[PDB]
Amino acid sequence: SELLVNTKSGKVMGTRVPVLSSHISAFLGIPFAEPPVGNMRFRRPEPKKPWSGVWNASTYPNNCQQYVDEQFPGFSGSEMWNPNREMSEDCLYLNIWVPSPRPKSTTVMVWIYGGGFYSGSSTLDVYNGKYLAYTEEVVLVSLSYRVGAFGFLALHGSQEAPGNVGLLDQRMALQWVHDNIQFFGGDPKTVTIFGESAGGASVGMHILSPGSRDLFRRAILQSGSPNCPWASVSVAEGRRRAVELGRNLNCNLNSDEELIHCLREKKPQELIDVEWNVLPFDSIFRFSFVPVIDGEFFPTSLESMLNSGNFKKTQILLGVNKDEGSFFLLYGAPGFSKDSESKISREDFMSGVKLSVPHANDLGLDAVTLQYTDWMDDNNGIKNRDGLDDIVGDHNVICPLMHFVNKYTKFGNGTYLYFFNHRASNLVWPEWMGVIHGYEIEFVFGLPLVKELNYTAEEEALSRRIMHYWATFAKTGNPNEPESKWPLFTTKEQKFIDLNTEPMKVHQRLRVQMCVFWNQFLPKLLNAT
Amino acid sequence: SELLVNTKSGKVMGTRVPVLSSHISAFLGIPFAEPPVGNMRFRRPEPKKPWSGVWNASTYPNNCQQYVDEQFPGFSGSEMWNPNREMSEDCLYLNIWVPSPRPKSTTVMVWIYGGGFYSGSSTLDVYNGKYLAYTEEVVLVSLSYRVGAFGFLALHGSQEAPGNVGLLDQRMALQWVHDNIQFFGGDPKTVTIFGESAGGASVGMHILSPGSRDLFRRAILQSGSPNCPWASVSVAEGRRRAVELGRNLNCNLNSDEELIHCLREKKPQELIDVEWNVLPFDSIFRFSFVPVIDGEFFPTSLESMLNSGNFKKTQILLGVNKDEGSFFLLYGAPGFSKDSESKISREDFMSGVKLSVPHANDLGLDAVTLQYTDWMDDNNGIKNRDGLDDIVGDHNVICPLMHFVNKYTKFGNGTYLYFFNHRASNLVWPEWMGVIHGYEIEFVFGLPLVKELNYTAEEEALSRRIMHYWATFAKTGNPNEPESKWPLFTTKEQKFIDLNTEPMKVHQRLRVQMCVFWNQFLPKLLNAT
Ligand SMILES: *[C@@H]1O[C@H](CO)[C@@H](O[C@H]2O[C@H](CO)[C@@H](O)[C@H](O)[C@H]2NC(C)=O)[C@H](O)[C@H]1NC(C)=O
Ligand SMILES: C/C=C1\[C@@H]2C=C(C)C[C@@]1(N)c1ccc(=O)[nH]c1C2
Ligand SMILES: C/C=C1\[C@@H]2C=C(C)C[C@@]1(N)c1ccc(=O)[nH]c1C2
Ligand SMILES: *[C@@H]1O[C@H](CO)[C@@H](O)[C@H](O)[C@H]1NC(C)=O
Ligand SMILES: *[C@@H]1O[C@H](CO)[C@@H](O)[C@H](O)[C@H]1NC(C)=O
Ligand SMILES: *[C@@H]1O[C@H](CO)[C@@H](O)[C@H](O)[C@H]1NC(C)=O
Ligand SMILES: *[C@@H]1O[C@H](CO)[C@@H](O)[C@H](O)[C@H]1NC(C)=O
């Protein structure tokens, strides 16, 4: 039967799912690791022990334990991102959408979700892979990995909580795909990993880490880079946050063994309740438990790895959205509100700058403020709001990604850069937020093709165009069909294209003026002072 | 006789001079101090001893000893600024143009020339006061003062070469005007001092210095402010440069007395020959012997004086030209030439930045470079050239002046700001230089009214308009006739007007973006690092 697949770990039974007046196969909730529960919490993952009989893969699995966004109860804009399945530490499963009839050896795409390493679910409606798998004839896989303390508590030197285990979960899923995707009709030698936000940083981290490189062929990074200021911490900071977490739960802090034991006896929600109390600074776009530069998963600092060309050399396709920063200003910066135009006063602007660049001294803050202020109209509420939006987006997403693309392109085999600037016609978030962080995902996964979702014909066309770009790239290493051509990004010309409902346009040096400030000047200033 | 005036110092005989098909009286070469020759070199000036008989004031006096510009022999563009009379240390004289018939008590304007405190002559063709005196019915006076080492060698603590003596020469001339202008038909209670470049800085210095304040009523500053980075040095730097000058002339440096004695035995040209060798840095728009913050002429630092409102409170009219920096880049920056378009490479740009901000460390240089570079087109020769032009103009003239105007306006009785951006149709300097430092002078002095000079009718109209603005301001403290109105500059609105052949336009916050960088950010950065 088409819904029955025998893998190296055992047999799995899928289910037929309808999609755009047709059907395909779906194998949901396939385990790729032993449940990281009990004495295994914080530990590196273990491969799932093979099973006898048939594994029922007809329904979505549980979501990992995580902070749940309750800032706007009942509001779909924020709740569509929250876990939509019961949460549980027993959450290491993957999902696969397979075209019908089953392919023999087709292109494979593996999705990595990414809410700042503290949130994410492979089961969100916006991650339904049936549309992409069906439309582009690719085997679509979505994995999962532990987030929050569960996946990133780091007490370097300890083997019980070494850190980066959430990344290792991802790696184990990729290993499983590499070993078994052939049985689902996928070609294990043509696997493209792609993710957004922390998922985008994750993709880049697998490109960097020696132990992950051989597990995939190509990569796509959306609004996220491995070198993002929020994507990793030093072994020392990781340890500090781990100890501080223990302090919040009245744990014995005499030894790593004492701390870990205590943390393992706590219920999942107890860790989540105090998770945010360990951040070192009052800030936005900063998360508590994230990957650590340990000398193992990451041999050396990310910058020296990028500079020496110490990473997987292949083709990459990546880009950013127009207003990456708006979402984070809304959730934490004074003056912003979901139901107002959020015009910002000169004072809230300064408070925003402080929250946006927590690690900066006064001179650094002045440099930022000067760089983003229109001194011929410094009290313009809209300009202050948009200025902060750009500050947060440039610092946390765009400029770190541009640094990565320029460093990578020097050794890579092909780079394609995009700038997504289309605001969906059916967004429920206010207009001032613009093209929000994470909102290119629905186009990548083809939601606009679903009539009931109220997208415009132009948006459906955009989705199809993006899906075909992503799938063609995954298949050939070039988004262009062998129409206007998406030029290759080169060190010299640095071309990129815009992704919107208007006729494609090619541009050059994406926000270069600002990124030179964030990538070259500010770091030098903070280091000299 | 109309050409005979009895002053408190003796009788003087003037001469009738033709002007625009008419005539007026001119009393040229009137001495206001004892010749600062011999043992008086470097000393404070002494009042001229009264004389018996009639002083022949029919011809221009000698010009003070100074460096002579030979960068373009035979070229009028540069030579029209060189001394046009024999040079001599016996140069402390003033010139007066009086309307005919002689007024009884009319508005007085005193011009102060200013080539970086190292050059200047009251006899230049562009300083002919007959046009302004005649056209506006004002008594026009042009004074003189020692420049170079002769007027500013400073060995603080010594009474033989205390420094600032060139400023004291100016003061003595103003004292003479205050005491005797009534006999020429001028009203000593309505004297406006005005000057350009170092002359503009001088005007501001008389506004600041307690001992000069009571000698005039109003002030006009053109392309120069007292706080300019090149307008003054500390007592320590002044001493260092004085000693270094002695070192260049093989002087005994055991004591101030030894050094001064040696310097006084040297011929004037010997000091001038090595004058430029004492600068501390390789730089442009920096001069060797300039005013010193001595605690006497200047009670305290200029900034604390400006901040505490410790200065003469009256009305001021001041402004700048569009391309203040071009002239200095041409004479000293790599890549610039008088006969080429001077497109600058990225490397010469960096060399230019270094020469423009000599006192800055590498971080400071990077900040400047970043601020003036268009990173979407960093190798554009014209943009690099224009960028350097702006850097030099903003740092040395415009931003220091804007800082002065904002500090002054807080305590002053009325401020009028202008931005001169008309390039004369008959300039012989290349087009890339634009509206050059010092080129608004010919319009202020009315040269365009002279047909033989080949100006356009529109330029004649502009000159008349400017002359009437200057004279009406000198007379009433308001440039506007009791036509489009020149708005008052206020701390709040910060309005100013443009001066060109096009219909007057009012603007706000003159180059505020750049000046915040130069006046607030860069100083803070250099101080923190
Ligand atoms: C990506 O790598 C390929 C192969 O390493 C580059 O193309 C090569 O194609 C052949 C090998 O398969 C060689 O014979 C060619 O010489 C080589 N291409 C050239 C002209 O050097 C390809 O250029 C790389 N693409 C990018 C964008 O770097
Ligand atoms: C940085 C946090 C994110 C990102 C964007 C949004 C809108 C919500 C978020 N919590 C989230 C939640 C779940 C998820 O899968 N991705 C993301 C990406
Ligand atoms: C800073 C030096 C200057 C200024 C502008 C020019 C063009 C020449 C200059 N040497 C000069 C020479 C004589 C003079 O009277 N003024 C000036 C003003
Ligand atoms: C598991 O499979 C059975 C059929 O064997 C069926 O009830 C359903 O698809 C799954 N059970 C659940 C989770 O309801
Ligand atoms: C489409 O529009 C209807 C009615 O306006 C609305 O109720 C519905 O929520 C929209 N579609 C979606 C995304 O549910
Ligand atoms: C000085 O005055 C005399 C007349 O007394 C006359 O020769 C001329 O105006 C002046 N002399 C000079 C400098 O030629
Ligand atoms: C006016 O033009 C003539 C002829 O073109 C030129 O020789 C002269 O120099 C100009 N006028 C001046 C400033 O001398």
Residue A497 DSSP label: E
| C-alpha torsion A155→A156→A157→A160, nearest 10 | 50
Q: With an 8 Å Cβ cutoff, are B525 and A363 in contact?
A: yes
Q: With an 8 Å Cβ cutoff, are A376 and B521 in contact?
A: no
Contacts of A307 by beta carbon, 8 Å cutoff, 6+ apart: A407
Tokens for B486, please give them: 């020149």
User: Which amino acid residue places its CA nearest to atom 2 of ligand 4?
Assistant: A56
Distance of alpha carbon A359 from alpha carbon A335, whole angstroms? 22
Tokens for B220, please give them: 């006009």
**Catalytically active residues of B, by annotation:** 197, 324, 437
Please tell me whether the peptide bond between B61 and the residue prior to it is cis, using omega within 30 degrees of 0.
Answer: no
The reply to whether A493 belongs to the active site is no
Tokens for B477, please give them: 């403290």
Contacts of B322 by beta carbon, 8 Å cutoff, 6+ apart: B419, B420, B421, B434, B435
Tokens for B225, please give them: 């402010």
User: With 0-12 CB in 10 A as exposed, 13-18 as middle and 19+ as buried, what is B504?
Assistant: middle
Ligand nearest to the CA of B59: 6
Contacts of B261 by beta carbon, 8 Å cutoff, 6+ apart: none
Q: With an 8 Å Cβ cutoff, are A375 and B525 in contact?
A: no
Distance of alpha carbon A322 from alpha carbon A394, whole angstroms? 10
DSSP β-bridge partners for residue A109: A140, A192
User: Which amino acid residue places its CA nearest to atom 10 of ligand 3?
Assistant: B115
B468 in Cβ contact with B488 (< 8 Å):
no
Q: How many CB atoms lie within 10 A of CB B234?
A: 14
What spacing in Å lies between the alpha carbon of B95 and ligand 6's midpoint?
16
Q: With an 8 Å Cβ cutoff, are A376 and B513 in contact?
A: yes
CA distances in angstroms from B529 to B282, B364, B520, listed in the order given: 21, 9, 15
CA atoms within 13 A on the CB side of B42: 26
Instruction: Give the best residue of B374, B525, B526 to mutate against chain A (max A CB count within 10 A).
Output: B525
Q: Domain containing A356 — which CATH number?
A: 3.40.50.1820
Which residues of chain A does B520 touch, with a Cβ-Cβ cutoff of 8 Å?
A: 366, 370
Largest CA distance in chain B: 73
Q: Which of B475, B467, B421, B426 is nearest to B443 (CA)?
A: B467
User: With 0-12 CB in 10 A as exposed, 13-18 as middle and 19+ as buried, what is A162?
Assistant: buried
What residues line ligand 5, using a CB cutoff of 6 Å?
A 452-454
DSSP β-bridge partners for residue B414: B315
Instruction: Name the residue of chain B whose CA is nearest to A510's CA.
Output: B376
**Number of residue pairs across A and B with CB atoms under 8 Å?**
47
Q: Which of B210, B212, B77, B209 is nearest to B143 (CA)?
A: B212
User: With 0-12 CB in 10 A as exposed, 13-18 as middle and 19+ as buried, what is B305?
Assistant: buried
Distance of alpha carbon B312 from alpha carbon B321, whole angstroms? 25
Q: With an 8 Å Cβ cutoff, are B529 and A524 in contact?
A: no
Distance of alpha carbon A520 from alpha carbon A480, whole angstroms? 33
To the nearest whole Å, the CA of A332 is away from the closest chain B CA by 28
Q: How many CB atoms lie within 10 A of CB A12?
A: 25
B140 in Cβ contact with B109 (< 8 Å):
yes
A72 in Cβ contact with A331 (< 8 Å):
no
Tokens for A309, please give them: 């060309």
B444: left (phi over 0), alpha (psi -120 to 50) or beta: alpha
Q: Which of A247, A201, A193 is nearest to A226 (CA)?
A: A201
Task: Report the residue numbers after which chain B has a gap, meaning the C atom sits over 2.5 angstroms from the next written residue's N, or none.
Answer: 482
Helices A362-372, A381-393: axis angle to 10 degrees equals 120
* Residue B454 Cβ contacting ligand 7 at under 6 Å: yes
Helix and strand tally (H, E) in chain B?
19, 16
Q: With an 8 Å Cβ cutoff, are A508 and B376 in contact?
A: yes
What spacing in Å lies between the alpha carbon of A4 and ligand 4's midpoint?
14
For residue A251, the enclosing domain spans 1-529
* Residue B120 Cβ contacting ligand 3 at under 6 Å: yes
Q: Which of A138, A140, A151 is nearest to A40 (CA)?
A: A151
DSSP β-bridge partners for residue A141: A96, A110
Instruction: Name the residue with tokens 């295994």.
Output: A40
The resolution in angstroms reads 2.1
Among A375, A517, A528, beta carbon nearest to B512: A375
Distance of alpha carbon B472 from alpha carbon B427, whole angstroms? 28
Distance of alpha carbon B178 from alpha carbon B190, whole angstroms? 10
Q: With an 8 Å Cβ cutoff, are B513 and A367 in contact?
A: no
Instruction: Enumerate long-range contacts of B279-283, CB under 8 Å, 24 or more apart.
Output: B279/B241, B280/B237, B280/B240, B280/B241, B280/B358, B281/B358, B281/B359, B282/B354, B282/B355, B282/B358, B283/B355, B283/B356, B283/B358
Tokens for B400, please give them: 């220091």
Q: What is the 3 state secondary structure string of B32-77? A: CECCCCHHHCCCCCCECCCCCCEEECCCCCCECCCCCCCCCCCCHH
Among A363, A370, A516, beta carbon nearest to B528: A363
CA distances in angstroms from B297 to B194, B195, B292, B301, listed in the order given: 19, 19, 9, 11
Method: X-ray
Handedness of CA A126, A127, A130, A135 (dihedral sign): positive
Contacts of B99 by beta carbon, 8 Å cutoff, 6+ apart: B24, B25, B106, B133, B134, B137, B138, B139, B185
What residues line ligand 4, using a CB cutoff of 6 Å?
A 56, 58-59
Q: Which of B172, B295, B278, B181 is nearest to B235 (CA)?
A: B295
The atom of ligand 5 lying closest to the CA of A454 is 1
CA distances in angstroms from B194 to A303, B43, B142, B147, B447, listed in the order given: 58, 25, 10, 18, 17
Pairing verdict, β B218-222 and B186-196: parallel
Tokens for A8, please give them: 């190296």
Distance of alpha carbon A278 from alpha carbon A243, whole angstroms? 9
To the nearest whole Å, the CA of A509 is away from the closest chain B CA by 7
CA atoms within 13 A on the CB side of A207: 35
What spacing in Å lies between the alpha carbon of B454 and ligand 7's midpoint?
7
A307 in Cβ contact with A178 (< 8 Å):
no
What spacing in Å lies between the alpha carbon of A461 and ligand 6's midpoint?
94
The reply to whether A437 belongs to the active site is yes
A477 in Cβ contact with A163 (< 8 Å):
no
The atom of ligand 2 lying closest to the CA of A127 is 15
User: With 0-12 CB in 10 A as exposed, 13-18 as middle and 19+ as buried, what is A464?
Assistant: middle
B343 in Cβ contact with B496 (< 8 Å):
no
DSSP β-bridge partners for residue B7: B10
Q: Which of B84, B72, B144 is nearest to B111 (CA)?
A: B144
Q: Which of B385, B407, B402 is nearest to B305 (CA)?
A: B407
DSSP β-bridge partners for residue A317: A220, A416
Which residues of chain B does A520 touch, with a Cβ-Cβ cutoff of 8 Å?
A: 366, 370
Distance of alpha carbon B462 from alpha carbon B474, whole angstroms? 18
A370 in Cβ contact with B516 (< 8 Å):
yes
Instruction: Name residue A104's amino acid.
Output: K
Q: Which of B122, B116, B67, B58 is nearest to B91 (CA)?
A: B122
B285: left (phi over 0), alpha (psi -120 to 50) or beta: left
- Residue A470 C-alpha from the chain's centroid: 16
User: Which amino acid residue places its CA nearest to atom 18 of ligand 2?
Assistant: A115
User: Which amino acid residue places its CA nearest to atom 3 of ligand 4?
Assistant: A56
Buried (b) or exposed (e) across B64-93, using 16+ Cβ within 10 A? bbbbebeebeeeebbeebbbebebebbbbb
Distance of alpha carbon B405 from alpha carbon A70, whole angstroms? 53
Q: Which of A511, A476, A259, A164 is nearest to A372 (CA)?
A: A511
A139 in Cβ contact with A103 (< 8 Å):
yes
Distance of alpha carbon B305 from alpha carbon B314, whole angstroms? 16
Catalytic residue among A156, A206, A422, A437: A437
Residues of A in CB contact (< 8 Å) with B are: 363, 366-367, 370, 374-376, 508-509, 512-513, 516-517, 520-521, 524-525, 528-529
DSSP β-bridge partners for residue B19: B22
Which residues of chain B does A513 touch, with a Cβ-Cβ cutoff of 8 Å?
A: 374-376
Contacts of B416 by beta carbon, 8 Å cutoff, 6+ apart: B315, B316, B317, B318, B473, B478, B479, B486, B488, B489
Q: Which of B28, B26, B27, B25 is nearest to B100 (CA)?
A: B25
Tokens for B451, please give them: 């047909």
Give the DSSP H or E segment for B180.
Answer: helix B165-180
B109 in Cβ contact with B471 (< 8 Å):
yes
Among A376, A508, A516, beta carbon nearest to B370: A516
Q: Which of B405, B46, B491, B430 is nearest to B222 (CA)?
A: B405
Residue A319 DSSP label: E
B180 in Cβ contact with B30 (< 8 Å):
no
Distance of alpha carbon A115 from alpha carbon A148, whole angstroms? 10
Tokens for A26, please give them: 């779906």
SS3 B458: helix
Residue-by-residue DSSP string for B346-397: HHHHHHHHHHHSTT--HHHHHHHHHHH--TTSTT-HHHHHHHHHHHHHIIII
CA distances in angstroms from B2 to A131, B10, B110, B183, listed in the order given: 102, 16, 21, 11
Instruction: Name the residue with tokens 């929050």.
Output: A148
Residue-by-residue DSSP string for A123-181: T-GGG-THHHHHHHT-EEEE-----HHHHH---BTBSSS-S-HHHHHHHHHHHHHHHHG
Instruction: Name the residue of chain A whose CA is nearest to B377's CA.
Output: A509
Instruction: Name residue A137's amino acid.
Output: E
Task: Report the residue numbers after which chain A has a gap, meaning the C atom sits over 2.5 angstroms from the next written residue's N, or none.
Answer: 482
What total of structural domains would you count in chain B?
1
Handedness of CA B125, B130, B136, B139 (dihedral sign): positive
To the nearest whole Å, the CA of A209 is away from the closest chain B CA by 33
To the nearest whole Å, the CA of A384 is away from the closest chain B CA by 15
To the nearest whole Å, the CA of A512 is away from the closest chain B CA by 6
Helices B362-372, B381-393: axis angle to 10 degrees equals 120
Distance of alpha carbon A89 from alpha carbon A78, whole angstroms? 23
* Residue B58 Cβ contacting ligand 6 at under 6 Å: yes
Please, where are the H alpha helices in B89-143?
130-136
Buried (b) or exposed (e) across A93-115, using 16+ Cβ within 10 A? bbbbbbbbebbeebbbbbbbbbb
Give the DSSP H or E segment for A466.
Answer: helix A457-476
CA distances in angstroms from A269 to A183, A240, A249, B159, listed in the order given: 38, 21, 12, 82
Report angle CA A179, A180, A181 to the nearest 5 degrees: 115
Q: Which of A512, A481, A478 is nearest to A494 (CA)?
A: A512
Catalytic residue among A25, A119, A122, A197: A197
What spacing in Å lies between the alpha carbon of A57 and ligand 4's midpoint?
8
Instruction: Name the residue with tokens 């989705």.
Output: A463
A301 in Cβ contact with A232 (< 8 Å):
no
Which residues of chain A does B370 touch, with a Cβ-Cβ cutoff of 8 Å?
A: 516-517, 520-521
Instruction: Name the residue with tokens 């219920």.
Output: A267
Handedness of CA B270, B271, B276, B278 (dihedral sign): positive
Instruction: Give the best residue of A493, A521, A526, A527 to mutate against chain B (max B CB count within 10 A).
Output: A521
